[PDB]
Structure formats: structure tokens, C-alpha cells
């Protein structure tokens, strides 16, 4: 390998990297400007509005670290993104999607199940009930994707086996 | 090995594209060091200037990764 050729090979992708990285930085700064642990949905919503899955991934890798910050209303925003991530061809996106989905299931599936099972009874409560119905619809759709991937590991464990078991009630 | 330098730039960039900024910075700082060490084994002045230009471009990318990490770290939980 000659110096000129090596330099040429390296430099080819520089402008691409500069554009992608400066755009991601700007977008993350936008998300950060509305950040508050008191309501993390606001930043998640901004990320979804920017419409760049890479920014969603970076934000989920953060909020996946503290489940106590998640509220039921956030689920109906995140689940559609989880659905995209579980179909990504990038292993690391699938893993972020799996981590978020396990978080939702472990934190919210009993509550969703209880609310939907309750005897019929308040605008706030009725909004919450419709949120729960939407979560269930979204989880039911995701469960089919999960079932189609739970056997990929064979005899071995995998994040998709875990999710399939966590979704057994659906 | 120039081929090794090319390969490490590629890995740094792939990891950055994928949001694995920790690993990206290992490869970015490693290859900046590799290039600098190689640069000064070069005796032709203009060839050294050309490698320094490349080094500066890689440094720009690495600084962008560092800025992204600083922003992400600023999300306190």
C-alpha cells in the first residue's frame, strides 16, 4: 500500500462523516434543550419529531438506564420505535430495542393488564384506559415479531427468548 | 502498516456511525497516534504535510465524537 492511495482511501469518507456527525450533534442538542427527568417524554417526542432513528437510539441508550423515569404515556410513543429497532439490520439497534421492550414489559404489563381487566367504572382515567388499549395493541403486534425471532438462538438463550417469555400472556 | 491505519479509520467511523462512541474514540485516538508516529518517519516535506492534513481531518471527526459524548453525558438521570 502506497501513501497516496492510503490517504485517498481515508479521505474519501471524511465529508460524509463530518456531515453525519455534525447533524447528529445538532439534533441531540435539540433533544437536550427540552430534557428534564420530571418528564422525559418531552425529549423523546422531540427525537421522534426529528425523524432520525440514530438520535432515538442514542436517547433510548440513556433513558433505558433508569426505568423509574418512564410513565405509561411514554409507552405509546416508544413502542413504535421499538418496532422499527427490532427490524433493524444493525445488531446494536436490535439490542437497544430489546432493552427498551423488556423495560416496558417488566414495568407496565401488569398495570396495563389490570386496567384493561377492571370492571367498567373521569377524563383522565378514560385517557389512561385508551392509552392502555393502545399499548396492548402495540404489544400484541410486537409479540408476533418477537415470536418469529425467539427460535433464532436454537437451544441457547437470547434476548428474544426472554421477551417471548415476558410476553406469554399476550 | 498503512493498511492497518486505513482499517482503524474505517472501524472508528463505523462505530461512530452506529452510536458506539466509546469504541469509536478508542479507534480514533489510536489511529491519530498511529498516523502521528508514522508522519514523522516521513522525510519528504510535502508528503508529511499531506499526512498532517489527513490527521487534521480525522481529528475533526474525533472532536465531533467527543462533543456528542459530552452532550450525551449531560443528560443527568
Amino acid at each position: 500500500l502506497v501513501d497516496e492511495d492510503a490517504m485517498s482511501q481515508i479521505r474519501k469518507g471524511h465529508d460524509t462523516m463530518f456531515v453525519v456527525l455534525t447533524s447528529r450533534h445538532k439534533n441531540l442538542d435539540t433533544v437536550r434543550a427540552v430534557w428534564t427527568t420530571g418528564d422525559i417524554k418531552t425529549s423523546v417526542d422531540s427525537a421522534v419529531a426529528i425523524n432520525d432513528l440514530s438520535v432515538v437510539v442514542d436517547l433510548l441508550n440513556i433513558v433505558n438506564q433508569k426505568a423509574s423515569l418512564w410513565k405509561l404515556d411514554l409507552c405509546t410513543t416508544v413502542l413504535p420505535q421499538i418496532e422499527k429497532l427490532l427490524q433493524s439490520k444493525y445488531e446494536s439497534y436490535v439490542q437497544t430495542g430489546c432493552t427498551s421492550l423488556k423495560l416496558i414489559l417488566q414495568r407496565f404489563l401488569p398495570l396495563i393488564t389490570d386496567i384493561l381487566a377492571a370492571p367498567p367504572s373521569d377524563i383522565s382515567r378514560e385517557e389512561r384506559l385508551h392509552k392502555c388499549r393502545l399499548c396492548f395493541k402495540q404489544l400484541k403486534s410486537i409479540s408476533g415479531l418477537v415470536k418469529s425471532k425467539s427460535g433464532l438462538s436454537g437451544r441457547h438463550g437470547s434476548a428474544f427468548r426472554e421477551l417471548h417469555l415476558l410476553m406469554a400472556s399476550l | 502498516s498503512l493498511q492497518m491505519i486505513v482499517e482503524n479509520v474505517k472501524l472508528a467511523r463505523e462505530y461512530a456511525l452506529l452510536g458506539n462512541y466509546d469504541s469509536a474514540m478508542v479507534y480514533y485516538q489510536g489511529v491519530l497516534d498511529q498516523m502521528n508516529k508514522y508522519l514523522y518517519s516521513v522525510k519528504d516535506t510535502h508528503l508529511r504535510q499531506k499526512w498532517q492534513q489527513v490527521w487534521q481531518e480525522i481529528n475533526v471527526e474525533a472532536k465531533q465524537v467527543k462533543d456528542i459524548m459530552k452532550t450525551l453525558e449531560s443528560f443527568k438521570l
Binding site: 469518507g13 462523516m17 453525519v20 440514530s54 | 467511523r13 463505523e14 456511525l17
Partner: peptide, 10 residues
């Protein structure tokens, strides 16, 4: 990121 990845891959 796919386009950028293919650029970097080439």
C-alpha cells in the same frame, strides 16, 4: 446511517 455506512465501506 446505511448510506454513510456503504460510503465508508467502499
Amino acid at each position: 446511517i446505511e448510506e454513510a455506512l456503504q460510503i465508508i465501506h467502499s
